[PDB]
Structure 1
Amino acid sequence: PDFMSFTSHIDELYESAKKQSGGKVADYIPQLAKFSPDLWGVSVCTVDGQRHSTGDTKVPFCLQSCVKPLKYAIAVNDLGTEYVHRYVGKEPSGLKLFLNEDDKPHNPMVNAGAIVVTSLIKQGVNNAEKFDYVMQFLNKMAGNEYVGFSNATFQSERESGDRNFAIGYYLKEKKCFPEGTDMVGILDFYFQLCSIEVTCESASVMAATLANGGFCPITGERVLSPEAVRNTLSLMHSCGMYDFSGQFAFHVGLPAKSGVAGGILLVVPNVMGMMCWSPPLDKMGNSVKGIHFCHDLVSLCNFHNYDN
């Protein structure tokens, strides 16, 4: 109703979260370890295309697990709910097992689930074509704003990803992939997708596409089917913030997805999309400043799912 006044509040919330200096920058690969703990950016894109940024909103960082709801949305857009969910579950798991009782990954937001979803997209073509296809989808979601790639993060993630190779071999053992899948090639594609780079600005447009029923707000183009968006938002709401998912659902009540680079892709349905980014993570793997910002945003603007 008054965007200028809303941005003053966003700036005040950004300043309050800026003081939260806690957390640890992820350091399992050098490409993550090098990031300054003081980098902090918040970008907003409303469903009507109004924009606002504060802080470090043009510094590229990897999507990491923030890409999981995006590739899940692409798979449902192309294949439908029924086909996708023959391979992956629909609910959160309690706070280590690679598969649920039905030999399926628990949901698309955990590594095993995202690895399986990766195997469903553009089957039958080489990895260069699969990657180009997802890149063109991400460009449409961001209204052609910054979508890049970190080869150094890709190389390091693959070289050091023993846990993801253990998951790949266990999924292969339990026949989790579509028949004729080259599992090692799927792991390559998975590491590549995690290594896609965005800024707070471009990622806020991707979150706004999810908030706007699948239509990119800065172009007006239909990018994702209503079904893909609805499924993605439901799973971001219950499975998107690692083992903090349940507490985030109760106190924040918004669909969101965190990543190890410090990003939090946030959706306020029919209102706006946001990307909050600060490299230091708490014990759950979520950006300390971003979590603080999310709690403050809902308390101030009453954006919670069940707020009257």
Structure 2
Amino acid sequence: LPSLEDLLFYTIAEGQEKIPVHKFITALKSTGLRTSDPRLKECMDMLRLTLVMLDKDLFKKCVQSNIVLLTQAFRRKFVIPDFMSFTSHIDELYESAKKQSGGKVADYIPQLAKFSPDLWGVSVCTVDGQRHSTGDTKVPFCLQSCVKPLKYAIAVNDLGTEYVHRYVGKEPSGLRFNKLFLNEDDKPHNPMVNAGAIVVTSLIKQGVNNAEKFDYVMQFLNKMAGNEYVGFSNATFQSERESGDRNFAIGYYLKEKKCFPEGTDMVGILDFYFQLCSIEVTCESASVMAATLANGGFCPITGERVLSPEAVRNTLSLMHSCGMYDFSGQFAFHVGLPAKSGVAGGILLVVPNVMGMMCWSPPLDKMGNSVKGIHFCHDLVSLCNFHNYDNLRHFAKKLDPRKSVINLLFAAYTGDVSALRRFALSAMDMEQRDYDSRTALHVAAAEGHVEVVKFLLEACKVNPFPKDRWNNTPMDEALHFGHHDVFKILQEYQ
């Protein structure tokens, strides 16, 4: 059992007796992990507490406490194994999109106009926590309609599909059925329209007052971003309630047409709605939110189950088809990713099973989508086979940036002679030990599996007397559990 810590040491130390601390860090960062990663804190603490050269046993002390993640990182077995060559493509696409200067920054409130039109940031967070940023990725801005899928997920996670969609539909609008707010059953078309977003707000945490509702949603967004920046621009909040007269009118129509949960303080909901629109993110922290959606409801940098599988599935679905304003059908055809855009210039972008992403540049096009971000999303999917209906085998000129010993013993356990035959012809080591120094022979003996024991002995010619951590041989195991014939067979080897 040559130890996992040294096994990695040999990976970094290409023959050197000791590894410099800075070689480890740049190798580390080369997988795309950041040293700020919460899952690497124990290791960085020890690195700093080595206060510059690390030998096999000093180094093994630092990496020991995060050895599972570092193992998966340096066996370059992340979802994107060659991250360095991936981040250059991201940088090329960023540089290219930076040259489109069209679009008008939203001035309907001054806080949206205070932002320079030159601001442009993209940040990547993969399902495994690899991070990458280019441009203005640590500037806070407001989510705006980028919060619509997030509050819809929360609702669905808490209440379930059937409840939520008693009050809101699940279809794209189609054309100008937008101005016809309500569909055939007199509900908003889907949660990504303002009328649907407003209704979704009325469903979240009913019974408590607004300040608890807002506290629930922020703690939730904070879990979704893995404790990265989730803020609030009160300035934006007050202008939004002052200019949101059109949404009050929409609210009165909704309350009169009985679309809210019966007994609902309408102006209370709309204050909540503007509160939620004003929540602040950076592209870094929003990308972790996106990567939580990209990763089935689990936050990559904390491991936490935040959203149920159903809430993610529904959210990603309606984002794919209702996420980009009147450009959503066009986006769905050509980009094929679930995204959501907002009037601060953010595009919350998700690549199911790979990464999340937030892009931000304030200039909006005629449809309200960020000009540089829309350019970026088209380029990304031309470059890589990320479209929803790209193939993972025959994808043409696009780039695709994408058996254990437990396997062995569980076959020995269940008696599957066919499986071990494949493994042996697979050139697997049939004498591998698990964490208990257990062997396929051990397990197959204890279960009295005669055709497995013989296969391991006669065909794979394995050692007949391995020792457990309790110093038992398969023969011991056979006797112990009543499998005398198996005991006899191995006894023939002494």
SS class of match (1:281): coil
Distance 1:239 1:88 in 2: 13
2:372 is matched with which residue: 265, 281, 289?
289
Q: Deviations over 1:95-128 (max 9, x none)?
A: 3122112110110000000110000001000111
SS class of match (2:123): strand
Q: Deviations over 1:274-296 (max 9, x none)?
A: 00000000001000000000000
Larger deviation, residues 93-102 vs 103-112? 93-102
1:28 is matched with which residue: 104, 108, 111?
108
Distance 1:214 1:43 in 2: 19
Q: Deviations over 1:230-287 (max 9, x none)?
A: 0000000000000000000000000000000000000000000000000000001000
Distance 1:127 1:97 in 2: 29
Larger deviation, residues 88-97 vs 281-290? 88-97
Moved over 6 A (4+): none
1:137 is matched with which residue: 220, 223, 232?
220
Distance 1:153 1:108 in 2: 22
Distance 2:367 2:174 in 1: 14
Summarize the alignment of residues 90-169 of structure 1 with structure 2, pairs less than 5 Å apart: 90-95=170-175, 96-169=179-252
Shift of 1:68: 0.1
Residue 66 of structure 1 corresponds to: 146
Q: Deviations over 1:114-155 (max 9, x none)?
A: 110000001000111000000000000000000000111110
Distance 2:285 2:264 in 1: 33
SS class of match (2:203): coil
Distance 1:283 1:60 in 2: 24
Distance 2:84 2:299 in 1: 22
Q: Deviations over 1:59-93 (max 9, x none)?
A: 00000000000000000000000000000000111
Shift of 1:94: 2.7
Distance 2:85 2:180 in 1: 47
Distance 2:325 2:171 in 1: 12
| Mapped pair 1:46 → 2:129 | no
Distance 2:157 2:368 in 1: 29
- Give TM-score scaled by structure 2 length: 0.62
Shift of 1:302: 1.5
Shift of 1:55: 0.2
- Give TM-score scaled by structure 1 length: 0.99
Distance 1:160 1:294 in 2: 31
Shift of 1:34: 1.3
Distance 1:51 1:223 in 2: 20
Distance 2:147 2:340 in 1: 9
Shift of 1:197: 0.3
Q: Deviations over 1:1-46 (max 9, x none)?
A: 2111000000000000000000000111111111110000000000
Distance 2:182 2:238 in 1: 27
Residue 85 of structure 2 corresponds to: 5
Distance 1:110 1:2 in 2: 39
SS class of match (1:119): helix
| Mapped pair 1:251 → 2:334 | yes
Percent of residue pairs identical: 100
Distance 1:152 1:136 in 2: 21
Distance 2:114 2:120 in 1: 15
Distance 1:56 1:137 in 2: 25
Distance 2:301 2:238 in 1: 34
| Mapped pair 1:86 → 2:169 | no
Distance 1:196 1:97 in 2: 29
SS class of match (2:171): coil
Distance 1:160 1:287 in 2: 22
Distance 2:240 2:215 in 1: 20
| Mapped pair 1:14 → 2:97 | no
Unaligned 5+ runs, structure 2? 1-80, 392-494
Structure possessing the higher relative contact order (Cα contacts under 8 Å, 6 or more residues apart): 1
Distance 1:280 1:91 in 2: 28
Q: Which has the larger share of strand? A: 1
Distance 2:276 2:180 in 1: 23
Distance 1:94 1:273 in 2: 27
Distance 1:247 1:103 in 2: 26
Distance 1:225 1:162 in 2: 35
Distance 2:385 2:240 in 1: 39
Q: Deviations over 1:188-209 (max 9, x none)?
A: 0000000000000000000000
| Mapped pair 1:224 → 2:307 | yes
Shift of 1:167: 0.7
Q: Deviations over 1:216-235 (max 9, x none)?
A: 00100000000000000000
